[PDB]
């Protein structure tokens, strides 16, 4: 019997191929599943849970700052979706814990999670560039939610990531460049291979979108961004929300390990 | 006036984003746009022929020596859009400069194109030759016709098939083919960012036409390499394909979208 | 073997025997006892690697399409002391190819070092329409420097030595043509990547990519387009030929006998 | 047209910047005489392969140490190649003798040509561990700005910084983790400084896959074996096949050389 090189766990090779729609636009259905969205109170992670919902998903929205229950509301009488909003401190380990096991709970099951780990930068008494992924809570994230995949032999892990021509950091690996899509890469790459038996895992690296996230930069500093973006603009928001329905419904079941790429051209060798 | 520095066709900067549906799968929609497909009497290219034509959209598939105007038949009959099969040789540019042209006189427009040279089907100095010319110079050859249209009209999206072939001596042609075409696709979608995306499609080991050969003590040493543990099927391609062609990714550019069941990417 | 390899098992047991160098860092750089192939050494980066190869100690095959040069070899025999020889051969030409490197094994013995200039040789005269510069661009600076390595490479494989330099070109750089140009150096990169690991028993291979160089292949630019070069050049300056000389030189000789697959810019600081 | 001012470092001037006037014999470009290089880290492995190719090819030599004495290897260079030798003791963490070390260097040689930053290695031991090594950037960062003062001043220099190779996992202490950081911020130093220092000086780094040394005497037969698996040459290298891009980047070989990464891994990194 012919074992794995990467895991064996997959068993007897080969591990059989999925029974797909024969069309290509029910490929792209989240009807029947549960989407678990951080970050989703405004910016990349509310317009993902609201294509999930027209997408057929259930939303589970997570918010801390501000309340989102009118959003998770909004879900429900737009959409016909169920959708409840959840108060976490993302870089809390024990309330990832508490909050993945309540929308499990509350669900039934999770069958779609997109770590969008949050964002600072300073501000000290004075401005005139660098910006921080909080990657611990992508950790905590996806530890508990692999459990629930391997429960249930299902899922699609989706982490939003950052191109290399954008200063993106994590907080315990600071530099001038970016440092924090090494990091979501590595991090992916693992999961992958280790979560191969039961999930996919992949990530989206978004360029410059006119969101919350860069929506702190002045006009003059955007134009430095057009100039080098070969589409000649930011991406809006509504143009990442395609990438994270391919990545997470049965549109990719054989796409894993990945990073699409989703930033007007700006990566460019 | 802000000037751009990758190309200057853009005008003034920012350049306008596009209008879009604010429903997520009306984006995937192919619904009033027109394809073109080459190698799509089989394999990966048929597979992506008929996922264009279920999106509702026109569908022009492309053909060597095995006469496919049945699949065209096919495509119209089942999904209610046109189609029509041509006879081509990509590795001959007046072919090709004939059937894209044909292909627009019949269609009125085409608005995606999907360049499969790579997946499509004794003397080595021959045989690196015939591949640089198939893998190479059959997707430059449709790059340039293909660019006429998509300039002319301000609209377009063009799809680059990365071969698979060289992962099943006889591996160097074919990789070689491969790098130039990842570099000449990075070229066009700088070039063409005022009217055209360009992205390219990476395949892993598709369990299709072009692995129909190779033995079973060869596909098992894939399937301990890839983490997923399998092959893919080509129905695990054709969203790949949707999304690019699509107003799903009007954003996204010089992009190369790895399907390949985690065989490190 | 007991220790096998994952990049070459035609390696044998591992490790492989460490070379054996001189003491002296200085005479790493001596081609004395070697023979080296420069293409594309009529005029140019050509013949500059090919003459400072020649000062270095080595017997020099030159090539030629055009302007034939049996006057220039003579120069190095004469200039030298080191047996030197000039061939003709259409690169585009496969025959050609192995019939121009097969003679230049019977008259030298063998090769130690080749030099792939087709990219910043000008051979590569109107050009019917787009798709027939498209096609002699790949003819010549891609399939060209495949041609090459296939008949250097059994005789590389044959001495269990062997240095191969390709030259990435310079030209799309420069002034559209630039896509056929930088898409056949982009083939010649990877190329070179995979040679080095097939050929890894017996050779090494190499690129070396120059940026914006004063030589012939530059020799039309108008002062518009140079001056944009200085102007993004870290140094603000073209290079001279006599600044590509000393990279070649530390490739062809056992000065990086444990350098392959790698590439060598020489740009002032061009690319970052 | 007029005067054209450059879009990297105004400093330049109008361009082109003359090119310098280099003897026409290759072999000449290579020599170091009449020129000194200073290399750190040259009571030790590399560090000392370096500096006594420095010597060979005719290069008065500083040679750096701090734990174990080096003044008999200054002795060495002086009568085996005739050269001026001295060695100097520094922690080259402290970024004030770092400061000294240099101006007194300054003073007995002259001037300062060549400089060669190798940062010291460290790694891990412990009562549970029989994989990362990290260096210290910041000794690298110190010896480059004190340096840059020497060259800009004399309008003349060639910095190169030892780097290392993405497969290889080097960490630096403000960057840990479980995959190569060091290169990218040694790059992005060289890089920087390639730039500011463009009008009087180049900078390079070179990056040595595996060699067989002492900073690597310290790993078990069963993961050298591993890394001869995935070198293409089959092995590991001698320091005396780092020397040569050693002296490549000091001499005058490369004076169109700046901004670049030397690789010397036997073919290790590759798509």
């Known amino acids: 019997e012919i074992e794995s090189y990467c895991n064996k766990e997959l068993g007897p090779l080969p591990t059989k191929a999925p029974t797909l729609s024969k069309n290509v636009l029910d ?5 029947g599943k549960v989407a678990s969205v951080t970050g989703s109170s405004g910016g990349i992670g ?3 849970a609201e294509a ?3 997408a057929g998903a259930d939303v589970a929205i997570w918010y801390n700052s501000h309340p989102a229950d009118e959003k998770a509301e909004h879900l429900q009488k737009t959409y016909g979706v169920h959708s409840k909003a959840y108060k976490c401190n993302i870089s809390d380990p024990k309330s990832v814990e508490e909050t993945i096991s309540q929308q499990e709970k509350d669900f039934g099951t999770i069958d779609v999670f997109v770590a969008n ?3 600072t930068w ?3 008494p004075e401005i005139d560039k660098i910006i921080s992924v909080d990657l611990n809570g992508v950790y905590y994230c996806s530890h508990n939610i692999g459990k629930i995949f391997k429960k249930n032999g299902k899922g699609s892990l989706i982490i939003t990531s950052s191109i290399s021509g954008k200063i993106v950091n994590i907080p315990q690996l600071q530099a001038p460049y970016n440092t924090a899509k090494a990091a979501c890469t590595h991090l992916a790459k693992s999961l992958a291979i280790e979560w191969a038996p039961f999930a996919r895992v992949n990530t989206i ?3 410059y979108i006119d969101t919350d996230i860069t929506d702190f930069a002045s006009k003059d500093m955007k134009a430095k961004w057009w100039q080098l973006t070969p589409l000649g603009r930011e991406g809006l928001t509504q143009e990442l929300v395609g990438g994270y329905l391919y990545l997470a419904s049965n549109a990719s079941t054989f ?4 990073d699409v790429v989703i930033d007007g051209g700006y990566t460019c060798p």
């Open 27 to 31: 490929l792209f259905s989240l009807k």
């Open 117 to 119: 780990a949050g964002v």
């Open 255 to 258: 796409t894993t390990g990945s």
């Open 205 to 207: 690296s978004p360029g």
């Open 46 to 48: 509310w317009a993902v």
């Open 122 to 124: 300073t501000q000290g």
């Open 52 to 54: 999930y919902a027209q």
